[PDB]
Amino acid sequence: AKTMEEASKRSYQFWDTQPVPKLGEVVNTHGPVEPDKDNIRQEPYTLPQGFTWDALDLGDRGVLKELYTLLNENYVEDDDNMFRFDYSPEFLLWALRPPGWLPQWHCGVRVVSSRKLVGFISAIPANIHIYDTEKKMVEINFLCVHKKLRSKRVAPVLIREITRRVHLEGIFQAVYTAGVVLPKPVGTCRYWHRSLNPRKLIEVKFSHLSRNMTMQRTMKLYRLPETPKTAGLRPMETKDIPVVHQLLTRYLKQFHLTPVMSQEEVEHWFYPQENIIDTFVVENANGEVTDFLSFYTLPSTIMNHPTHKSLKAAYSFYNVHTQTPLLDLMSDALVLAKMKGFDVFNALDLMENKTFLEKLKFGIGDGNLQYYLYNWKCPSMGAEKVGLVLQ
């Protein structure tokens, strides 16, 4: 189910067993669905015959390559099966080893004979602030199962084991994003797309030539300046971590679903990593960092095309503004993404993004992204109040 009222006809054999609100009920309360567990099951769940759980050590170049191969061939694809995500192995380390990570939270499923890797689910620790409560949670990401093994009960087995792994560490809530519709989204966010290299997107059928438009006008409509216009804009470095932390912490207090990051976590998620995360800050004439922007790089493999293979994309992260308008900040981000060789710039409609989306030639996309909270009952909010970005 991709649209919400098509989920109404469905019935959930597994999500009616889990402590999540029902899709129909209105939520007027703020609290857990079930009590914290006194005893936690000690034995891993039973995988089907010929399969055994593992714990991938991503510090191994060989195991990480296995994880990249598993995701590169079996991860998320578009609705028409044209594009598949292409997370970098260096990207995976960035998003699977933040401060506090645990090896048993990189759960993998292997075949006993081949020792091949046919599944994966992940969990990293995250301090999440939801409405007026601040809860120690985990972010579930990279739920993958091999294509040959699909549609045979293996997905609900992955969810129960990873829950058991995190229940053993005292954490009983969780947060995660998905495109499908499940009980029950606390927020729904629409993707928007800004084309930096419109020639390639049209050739690979990412977008189509609009109503009554030539390529020459479209090439000249989406063109961008050479260099950024904002004064004193430069990449982030070590000396900028404490202030960038301080800027994001106050900026987020207006939204209702945000993270709570320590100075070590801010350094991890925002310090520039080439081909993974790009952060730029704005330093004024008094030597004060007053604004910053950020985007991360996630390309996807172009399928069944003889000449075009990859689709380089940049995803808007967190952009905090205090003395520079958000409109100028995001415009220079497009220019910065154009200089680095991106073909498209994707951004959600969460936070204040709906103010600059239309004005900066962003095109509204087909897909929806849902936000979920495990074991937390709270009233659903609007997309303008979401302040949480995951990879």
């Binding site: 578009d78 994003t177 998905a178 495109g179 993707y191 990412f206 994707n346 959600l348 996309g365």
Partner: peptide, 8 residues
């Protein structure tokens, strides 16, 4: 960006 979307 966790799920895939194209311009419409």
């Amino acid at each position: 960006g966790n799920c895939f979307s194209k311009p419409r």
